[PDB]
Amino acid sequence: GYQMDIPKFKRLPRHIAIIPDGNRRWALARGLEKHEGYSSGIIPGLEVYDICVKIGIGEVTFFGFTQDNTKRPQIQRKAFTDACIKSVQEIAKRDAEILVVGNTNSDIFPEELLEYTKRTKVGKGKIKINFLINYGWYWDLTYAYDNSPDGKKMIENIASAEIPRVDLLIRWGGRCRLSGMLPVQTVYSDIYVVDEMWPDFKPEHLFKALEFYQNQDITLGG
Amino acid sequence: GYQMDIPKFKRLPRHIAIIPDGNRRWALARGLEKHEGYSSGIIPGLEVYDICVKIGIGEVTFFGFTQDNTKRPQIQRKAFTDACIKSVQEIAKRDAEILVVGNTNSDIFPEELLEYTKRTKVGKGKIKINFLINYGWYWDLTYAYDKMIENIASAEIPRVDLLIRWGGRCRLSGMLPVQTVYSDIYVVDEMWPDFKPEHLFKALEFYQNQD
Ligand SMILES: CC(C)=CCC/C(C)=C/CC/C(C)=C/COC(CO)CO
Ligand code: DMA
Ligand code: DMA
Ligand SMILES: [Mg+2]
Ligand SMILES: [Mg+2]
Numbered sequence A: 001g002y003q004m005d006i007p008k009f010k011r012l013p014r015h016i017a018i019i020p021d022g023n024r025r026w027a028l029a030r031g032l033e034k035h036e037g038y039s040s041g042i043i044p045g046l047e048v049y050d051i052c053v054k055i056g057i058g059e060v061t062f063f064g065f066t067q068d069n070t071k072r073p074q075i076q077r078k079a080f081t082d083a084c085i086k087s088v089q090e091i092a093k094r095d096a097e098i099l100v101v102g103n104t105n106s107d108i109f110p111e112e113l114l115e116y117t118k119r120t121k122v123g124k125g126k127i128k129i130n131f132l133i134n135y136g137w138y139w140d141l142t143y144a145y146d147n148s149p150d151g152k153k154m155i156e157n158i159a160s161a162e163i164p165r166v167d168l169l170i171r172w173g174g175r176c177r178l179s180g181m182l183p184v185q186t187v188y189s190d191i192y193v194v195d196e197m198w199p200d201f202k203p204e205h206l207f208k209a210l211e212f213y214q215n216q217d218i219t220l221g222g
Numbered sequence B: 001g002y003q004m005d006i007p008k009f010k011r012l013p014r015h016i017a018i019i020p021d022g023n024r025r026w027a028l029a030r031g032l033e034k035h036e037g038y039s040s041g042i043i044p045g046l047e048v049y050d051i052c053v054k055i056g057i058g059e060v061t062f063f064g065f066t067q068d069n070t071k072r073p074q075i076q077r078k079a080f081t082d083a084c085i086k087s088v089q090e091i092a093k094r095d096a097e098i099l100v101v102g103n104t105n106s107d108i109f110p111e112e113l114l115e116y117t118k119r120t121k122v123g124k125g126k127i128k129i130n131f132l133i134n135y136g137w138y139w140d141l142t143y144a145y146d147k148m149i150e151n152i153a154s155a156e157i158p159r160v161d162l163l164i165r166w167g168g169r170c171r172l173s174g175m176l177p178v179q180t181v182y183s184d185i186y187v188v189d190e191m192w193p194d195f196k197p198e199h200l201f202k203a204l205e206f207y208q209n210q211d
Helices: A023-029 A034-040 A042-055 A074-091 A111-116 A137-147 A152-156 A203-215 B023-029 B034-055 B074-092 B111-116 B137-142 B197-208
Strands: A015-019 A059-066 A096-101 A120-122 A128-135 A168-171 A190-193 B015-019 B059-066 B096-101 B120-122 B128-135 B162-165 B184-187
Touching (some): A015 A042, A023 A034, A042 A074, A042 A203, A074 A096, A074 A111, A111 A128, A128 A137, A152 B137, A168 A203, A190 A203, B015 B034, B034 B059, B074 B120, B096 B111, B184 B197
Parallel strands (some): A015 A168, A059 A128, B096 B128, B162 B184
Antiparallel strands (some): A096 A120, B096 B120
16 A cells, blocks of 8 residues: 554454444535445545554454445445445455355345355455445344254354454444444454544554553453 | 532433443452452442432343353352342342343352342332343353244343443453443443442443434
8 A cells, every 4th residue: 555654563453343433424524415424434444454464463354334224315325335345346456355244135235245255365365354244233143043953053153153253343433332243253352442433544543442452451251 | 418419411321231340450459369359349339229220220230240250260259259149139128120140050150149030129129120140142142042032041131222341441241242232332440349420420421422
């Protein structure tokens, strides 16, 4: 991308989850229409990707859109779907192992992303980039209750089973909440909230989240 | 006044979750042994109860201890279990509808609390007080094998509106994965035994500021 001065970290998370929230508030604050913020969320994702590749983060999961989000106005649904498609396509121009997880048994799921619903190497690969597209926490848990008979097997067979435990979850837009992102993988996740809206992303947001992470005692109830 | 005037709130959560974390760090900071913090966590719980009753909170769920917590040394297990028993027994002397949710199929689950594993009205009731005792997220979700989502072990406990965690960590530690999917989370930096009413007031000011 371009040259940065990235701090040195004593400890790095294996898996970062990103909640790129605040697109509508960002747009309204700039006197744009609510749905116009999503198109300004793509370059921030690429800056996150570039930083994570440079420091050697193993896996990053981006919250794209939920089944609940598809209750919003058509004009917003078209805007955030278009922006999610573009984000996956942009990572597909770089070096990544791409996975899209979400309900593909829905008219809402974009045909453009079906090819990424199995993990796909692009360029030199290495870093795992996941996207949650038409994802729902209820759909994810209930996927298991149907397609797993046993109980101990249920957990291993949730819809998002390819996505491992989230070490660090970073949420833009100043809300401290999961919005149903990966309930199983996020039970022990250390959560960092950035007050600025996602389109106002700065590398310093990610650096401060990583400083937060390396400062945590990760005890897992022990 | 002696006790801070309880502020008047323009919005209130129906259901507050409490994670009373930091007992061991609190004890170690005082030069006590790791296990000596838990007994100093009981009165804070009663202060939360008193304030929630006064402002008219419908439901409060306390995180007591988890299956993961039973990995800890036996001296710590006995100390936190003893403190959880005493907490429920103290609420049992007041006005509450008490429910204990947790894995009762374990010699770790205290016999004293079996009677509260069905919702129990004490005094005038009018507030629902839940305790998670030998609770595990994994046990909760997998319990359904006993519609499946509506038959999780914690199914009686509704959506958490506001989650307040003491001890400075911003994490769920597996508290009620289903009910916490949209919960607004407020972290208090002070360890649970350093509870002050202003901790709770600031959490509720945070909640009424959320959209
Ligand atoms: C790696 C890259 C390139 C991009 C990652 C970011 C991304 C998915 C951008 C796409 C548009 C976007 C902001 C969607 C998020 O919207 C939801 C959250 O608030 C629902 O409204
Ligand atoms: C009372 C209670 C169950 C607290 C949760 O924190 P924890 O210390 O048990 O977990 P963690 O190690 O994830 O902070
Ligand atoms: C499991 C439980 C009863 C949590 C309360 O604090 P703690 O025992 O986790 O103490 P700390 O967070 O300081 O280790
Ligand atoms: Mg939002
Ligand atoms: Mg703790």
